Amino acid sequence: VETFAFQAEIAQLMSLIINTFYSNKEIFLRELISNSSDALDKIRYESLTDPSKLDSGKELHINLIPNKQDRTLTIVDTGIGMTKADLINNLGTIAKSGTKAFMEALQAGADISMIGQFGVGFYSAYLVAEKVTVITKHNDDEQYAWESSAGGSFTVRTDTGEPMGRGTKVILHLKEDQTEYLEERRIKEIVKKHSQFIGYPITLFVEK
Ligand SMILES: COc1ccc(-c2c(-c3cc(-c4cncc5ccccc45)c(O)cc3O)noc2NC(=O)C2CC2)cc1
Structure with missing residues (x-):
């Protein structure tokens, strides 16, 4: 388990x-x-x-x-997946400018919902999650687990859990007052309202 600091700008955004x-x-x-x-x-x-x-x-x-x-x-998702360098360096590097621009936009009146326009939408997970754990697997590379409860640091380790074939699994550990996002009806509503134009199947697993 290695622990890293977020880029300053990203820690501020979080x-x-x-x-x-x-x-x-x-x-x-x-x-x-x-x-x-x-x-x-x-x-x-x-x-x-x-x-x-x-x-x-x-x-x-x-x-x-x-x-x-x-x-x-x-x-x-079964997308391309991320490498170790993605998790430690690349995601942060390619987000720096958008993060700075988004922060400036916020200070100048813009609202949080604009976040995706700046390419840093991931961090909106912290609106509802106290901790985010991400398992990822890129071809010809090992499976990794990234994790952060914010507060300025994240961890990266090689994951020995159940093998994914390829892709990324984002696990949101929700804040106690945000359980509405565990309801089938609510998730459906949100997906229909905001994500109706995605070129891949989105399947909601209903709990038994
Ligand atoms: C918007 O920028 C990006 C950057 C990278 C990706 C990405 C993901 C992925 C990433 C995140 C995510 C995005 N941002 C921060 C994250 C932080 C931790 C864990 C996942 C993160 C996610 O939630 C789900 C995913 O499937 N998997 O492979 C990728 N490789 C690329 O696309 C190559 C740069 C081309 C997606 C969007």
Whole structure:
């Protein structure tokens, strides 16, 4: 287990998201679905010239998995997946400018829902989650677990859990007052309202 500090700007953005009173929290789901869609686009495109890249799984889709017992909402995709360098360095590097621009926009009146326009929508997860754990697997690389409860640091480790074929699994450990996002009807509403134009199947797993 290695522990890292977030880039300064990103840590500041996370603090703002966590501490600003903002009722329209449902936007987190659209942003995570959008990220999955981008990752799916990437593996789809790469497979067009190298179909062996789908040996780790041909289906390109997104599953939404609420679990009231664990108080978790899981967003799983079979996209390209992330490398160790993605988790430690690249995600942060490619987000820096958008983060700075988003922070400036906020100070100048813009509202939190604009976050996705700046390419940093992931961090809206912290509107509803006290901790986010992400398992990811890129071809020809190992499975990793990323995790953060904010507060300025994240961890990365090699994951010895159940093998994913390829893709990314975002596990939102929800805040006690945010359990509405574990309800079937609510998730359906949110997906229809914000994520109706995604080129991959989105499947809601109903709890038994
Ligand atoms: C918007 O920018 C990005 C950056 C990277 C990705 C991405 C994901 C992915 C990432 C996040 C996510 C996005 N942002 C921060 C995250 C932080 C921790 C864990 C997942 C994160 C996620 O929620 C779901 C995913 O399937 N998987 O592979 C990817 N590779 C790329 O796309 C190559 C740069 C081309 C998606 C969007």
